[PDB]
Design a protein around this ligand. Structure first.
Ligand SMILES: C[C@@H]1C(=O)C[C@@H](CC(O)O)C1(C)C
Ligand SMILES: C[C@@H]1C(=O)C[C@@H](CC(O)O)C1(C)C
Ligand SMILES: C[C@@H]1C(=O)C[C@@H](CC(O)O)C1(C)C
Ligand SMILES: [Ca+2]
Lengths: 249, 248, 248
């Protein structure tokens, strides 16, 4: 009854999906160029993470982008931000986006190929975070645009960076370069652009060779605290964010 | 019903309060010199943080000191530490001090103008922590004086520095200089003394210009974990600290 | 009713116990050489930590190893890993090992004298962590052997290193050298091999001179968050580890 890979691999216009030897490579893109963040990309990721989670033939996941950026452009006009009922669609799919990600029960490796200023919390939620020398991280579309960082940004960044670095990062428009993200512990390795994906594949293949349950349960036992805090705080954030945003108009 | 700024701005002998365009500058001091930590200062800050939290015209808060230190002197004689009933007055206000601070629903920026050895947890609870080059941080009046660090120090330092740095900091008398505090992630920027307040103002102004509810809710959504652990552990620490102190 | 020191000090074949002025030195070893990790050493540590926790004459604890390594050799054949009932014995004692450790209500100092690749979470759960220049840390016997790091490794390493460093450390076979552990905040001081134990004793003696209840309650107020997450997550990890291991 689960959707096998042959049925969802071609379902998402902003998500290329390729699998070899059980290693699933997820590449986010807009027509083969670097991803432009939209309502569609947001909702596709939520549905796609569900499909990935429920497909037991995925042994390990690599999340990456294409071209010079991971995602450093947004189309705010693709979203409807004016009313509560419009925001409820965002809240419902925004919960699904992060919760479906956390429901994936294999290790997730991020390969951040350049700047990410929209949804940077997604790659940094990964178990292993690899960054190109050119990678940067910024919470672009929230407080710099007068929007509350209430969509999980508020959970992930204090969780990964620490309390003070996390709050400062979210309130001051801070952009972390690759080596700063490494120093702060958000990134595990900084690699040249050409080395990045080969390294992601190397690590993924080694993990995929580990015993079935050891691999799946390693992921499961390691996501406990993030799941606890996300359940405690995510919906609270989203509802406050929606209220503040509706006040704008 | 809330006390307006015109009434509370002049209420507290150790806290100067000045507000311009909704940016509230809170300057702790003893007679215009660097703050000397006392029972009065402790209790005033608790009452003052309540007034600040309840006054919606505060858009953003800057907490700072004056002179060469933020707070690096204490008068232990100003406190009554000998009996349970005396300790309950400290426990009650000590709870209010940190809970009232967390009840403020606008962003709080700390500008640490020099050494802080008493109540350093207060500035480091801020959303943005700026330090002068001369700033230092030490949990002065707890374990070095044979007193349990049970007043919220035990919550804040492991939370912000991490488990092993936090516990070591509290048990060994460690003093963090500004660049070590920066490296440990307790401080966000280290500035020259003359740039410190200008930078705090620049950040505050920028925040104050954000939309009303975005600015308020940013603070709310970001203090969840600290509020959870403070509720779980603060009163426990204070009661144990009182017991050990009375045993002296 | 509690076992005094004169009755448990000689009980354990892999744990030497010496006490001077209330400072208890716990030295893990295999016939006077560096500890080889076994089922015996694991269960002994669980019982030993209980004895130490219940003995009020322990004022401070130093945990250390001997020789070139703290513990960098394991005997997998000493363990029975094939069936659920065998795994229940490991789960039950594995819970006791870490829970008994956390139940100790005096400050715990680790003095990591060299490489630790088995049970490295034990020393890093200490309040003060001192490492020789030659110390290294690695989660040896879990994921590199195709075994889930579900025995507390999953709690401790994300807790002390942070979410991303902790997960990466457990999933990639990473070995931290002493200065990397220091930078990551898992270690507080790095010392020469000759300086290590003298520094542990220096710190322990200083702590031991603090007032009785202040010393005891300092430990108690500082272990809250670790105790909370261990209770939330330890048994979940052990049961999943057991299931995966039996599937082999
Ligand atoms: C860019 C953002 C999301 O993708 C959906 C909205 C809510 C969110 O995730 O913060 C947004 C602000 C438009
Ligand atoms: C300096 C300290 C406080 O201000 C009140 C007392 C309890 C506390 O906060 O730790 C004290 C020990 C006198
Ligand atoms: C080395 C390990 C422990 O000491 C007991 C077993 C379970 C564990 O993970 O603690 C083990 C895998 C043999
Ligand atoms: Ca660091």
């Amino acid at each position: 009854l689960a959707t096998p890979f042959q049925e969802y691999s071609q379902k998402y216009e902003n998500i290329r999906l390729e699998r070899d030897g059980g290693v699933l490579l997820v590449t986010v893109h807009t027509e083969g160029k670097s991803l432009v963040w939209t309502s569609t990309a947001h909702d596709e990721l939520a549905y796609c993470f569900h499909d990935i989670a429920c497909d037991r033939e995925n042994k390990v996941v690599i999340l990456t982008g294409t071209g010079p950026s991971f995602c450093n452009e947004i189309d705010f006009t693709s979203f409807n931000l004016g009313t509560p009922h419009d925001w409820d669609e965002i809240i419902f799919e925004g919960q699904r986006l992060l919760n479906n990600l956390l429901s994936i029960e294999v290790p997730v490796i991020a390969a951040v190929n350049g700047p990410v200023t929209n949804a940077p919390e997604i790659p940094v939620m990964s178990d292993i975070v690899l960054a190109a020398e050119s990678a940067t991280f910024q919470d672009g579309p929230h407080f710099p645009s007068g929007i509350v960082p209430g969509d999980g940004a508020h959970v992930v960044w204090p969780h990964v960076l620490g309390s003070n670095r996390g709050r400062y990062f979210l309130l001051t428009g801070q952009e972390l370069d690759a080596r700063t993200a490494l120093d702060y512990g958000a990134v595990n390795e900084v690699l040249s652009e050409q080395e990045l994906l080969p390294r992601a594949w190397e690590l993924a293949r080694g993990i995929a060779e580990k015993p079935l349950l050891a691999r799946r349960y390693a992921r499961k036992v390691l996501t406990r605290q993030l799941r606890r805090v996300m359940e405690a705080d995510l919906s609270l954030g989203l509802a406050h964010e929606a209220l503040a945003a509706i006040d704008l108009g």
